[PDB]
Design an enzyme around this catalytic site. Structure first.
Site, PDB file in Angstrom:
ATOM      1  N   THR A  70       0.857  -1.249   0.040  1.00 52.40           N
ATOM      2  CA  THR A  70      -0.095  -0.081  -0.019  1.00 52.40           C
ATOM      3  C   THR A  70       0.997   1.202  -0.027  1.00 52.40           C
ATOM      4  O   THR A  70       0.528   2.533  -0.181  1.00 52.40           O
ATOM      5  CB  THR A  70      -1.017   0.172   1.355  1.00 52.40           C
TER       6      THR A  70
ATOM      7  N   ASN B 236       5.125   7.439 -24.188  1.00 50.99           N
ATOM      8  CA  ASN B 236       6.192   7.950 -23.454  1.00 50.99           C
ATOM      9  C   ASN B 236       6.301   9.294 -24.277  1.00 50.99           C
ATOM     10  O   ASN B 236       7.502  10.005 -24.142  1.00 50.99           O
ATOM     11  CB  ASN B 236       7.574   7.465 -23.579  1.00 50.99           C
TER      12      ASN B 236
ATOM     13  N   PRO C 270     -10.472   2.928 -25.992  1.00 47.37           N
ATOM     14  CA  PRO C 270     -11.119   3.218 -24.645  1.00 47.37           C
ATOM     15  C   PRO C 270     -11.428   1.541 -24.138  1.00 47.37           C
ATOM     16  O   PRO C 270     -11.006   1.561 -22.825  1.00 47.37           O
ATOM     17  CB  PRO C 270     -12.630   3.740 -25.008  1.00 47.37           C
TER      18      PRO C 270
ATOM     19  N   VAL D 118      -9.625  -1.069 -24.055  1.00 48.67           N
ATOM     20  CA  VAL D 118      -8.652  -1.851 -23.417  1.00 48.67           C
ATOM     21  C   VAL D 118      -8.231  -1.261 -22.112  1.00 48.67           C
ATOM     22  O   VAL D 118      -8.552  -0.398 -21.545  1.00 48.67           O
ATOM     23  CB  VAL D 118      -7.200  -2.036 -24.777  1.00 48.67           C
TER      24      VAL D 118
ATOM     25  N   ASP E 271      -6.533   4.051 -17.737  1.00 47.63           N
ATOM     26  CA  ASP E 271      -6.941   3.262 -16.740  1.00 47.63           C
ATOM     27  C   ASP E 271      -6.453   2.973 -15.655  1.00 47.63           C
ATOM     28  O   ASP E 271      -7.135   2.851 -14.293  1.00 47.63           O
ATOM     29  CB  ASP E 271      -7.481   1.840 -17.383  1.00 47.63           C
TER      30      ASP E 271
ATOM     31  N   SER F  23       6.123   1.329 -21.476  1.00 46.45           N
ATOM     32  CA  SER F  23       6.450  -0.129 -21.923  1.00 46.45           C
ATOM     33  C   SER F  23       6.839  -1.123 -20.810  1.00 46.45           C
ATOM     34  O   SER F  23       6.239  -2.190 -20.813  1.00 46.45           O
ATOM     35  CB  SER F  23       7.253   0.095 -22.792  1.00 46.45           C
TER      36      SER F  23
ATOM     37  N   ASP G  31      -2.199   7.871  -4.319  1.00 44.32           N
ATOM     38  CA  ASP G  31      -0.737   7.834  -3.965  1.00 44.32           C
ATOM     39  C   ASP G  31       0.178   8.475  -4.795  1.00 44.32           C
ATOM     40  O   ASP G  31       1.366   8.629  -4.479  1.00 44.32           O
ATOM     41  CB  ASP G  31      -0.285   6.419  -3.722  1.00 44.32           C
TER      42      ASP G  31
END
Lengths: 10, 279
Positions: free
Chosen positions: B16, B161, B175, B177, B200, B224, B260
């Site tokens: 976490t 990148n 969208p 995937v 996502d 990658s 985070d």
């Protein structure tokens, strides 16, 4: 090192 | 199970908080699942794959990884020491030449190949496809990615990148995937990582140690590298029965570490791949 490559889109 | 002194990325996926060193994961380790690494190929002979890696298709004269990229990504999916799902089956599909490049027609062909080829592999726990590649926006590339996903494969693709919105890159912009961004050891968005609303999830992508050709190892950075962490996590979770190929991406998002990451632009999810493994 990272990613790849492009163009044409069949 | 616990892997001590694991690569920071593996340890981050079972924590976490950042800064830990042990990777905790269920002993099933992705057994019975299969992950197609659509890249420059896989050095199947590398001892780290323990015989679980195989080349199944190439679009070039040889099926050898003469670059290293594909091997490194496969390594993060399932090598013994550097992989998320240590018992998964790895299938190499070489759509990138030895310089790391490939025409979109070829990459599209590779995605359609996997959609059909899986119908003749033994993968009782499910199929995953990892695409650590990308280029400018292409409706055709995105459609291929969407077809692969619709066919019953968990597709994870790199956000890119370019330190820009992934909406202008393919197959990142598709969208349906799982579009993956990169993070570093200190929970910062990787400097190079693309961002945006189509993302996502985030995975470790900076300074990632994994397998390389010539039976070696090396650390490299990129969205990658983040992509195969999510692909491996999907396989791992599918083997555990927690999710399916169709739902794995939102399942991973549902269960991610939330809030985070730093330097996340407004409009981009602050979610980081997490296996939620409780011994």
């Amino acid at each position: 090192k990272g990613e790849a490559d492009a163009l044409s889109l069949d | 199970a616990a892997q001590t002194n694991a690569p920071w990325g593996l340890a981050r996926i079972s924590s976490t908080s950042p800064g830990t060193s042990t990777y905790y994961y269920d002993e099933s380790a992705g057994q019975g699942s299969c992950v197609y690494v659509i890249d420059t190929g896989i050095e199947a002979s590398h001892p780290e794959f323990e015989g679980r890696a195989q080349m199944v298709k190439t679009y070039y004269y040889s099926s050898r990884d003469g670059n290293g990229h594909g091997t490194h990504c496969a390594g993060t999916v399932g090598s013994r020491t550097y992989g998320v799902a240590k018992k998964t089956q790895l299938f190499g599909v070489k759509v990138l030449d030895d310089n790391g490049s490939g025409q979109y027609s070829t990459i599209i062909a590779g995605m359609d190949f996997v959609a059909s080829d899986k119908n003749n592999r033994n993968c009782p726990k499910g199929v995953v496809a990892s695409l650590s590649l990308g280029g400018g926006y292409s409706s055709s590339v995105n459609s291929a990615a969407a077809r692969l996903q619709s066919s019953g494969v968990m597709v994870a693709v790199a956000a890119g990148n370019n330190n820009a919105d992934a909406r202008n890159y393919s197959p990142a912009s598709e969208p349906s995937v799982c579009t993956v961004g990169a993070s570093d050891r200190y929970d910062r968005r990787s400097s190079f990582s693309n961002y945006g609303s189509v993302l996502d999830i985030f995975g470790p992508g900076t300074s990632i140690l994994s397998t390389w050709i010539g039976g070696s190892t090396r650390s490299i950075s990129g969205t990658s590298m983040a992509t195969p962490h999510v692909a491996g996590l999907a396989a791992y979770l599918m083997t555990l029965g927690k999710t399916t190929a169709a739902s794995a991406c939102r399942y991973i998002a549902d269960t991610a570490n939330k809030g985070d990451l730093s330097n996340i632009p407004f409009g981009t999810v602050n979610l980081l791949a997490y296996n939620n493994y409780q011994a």
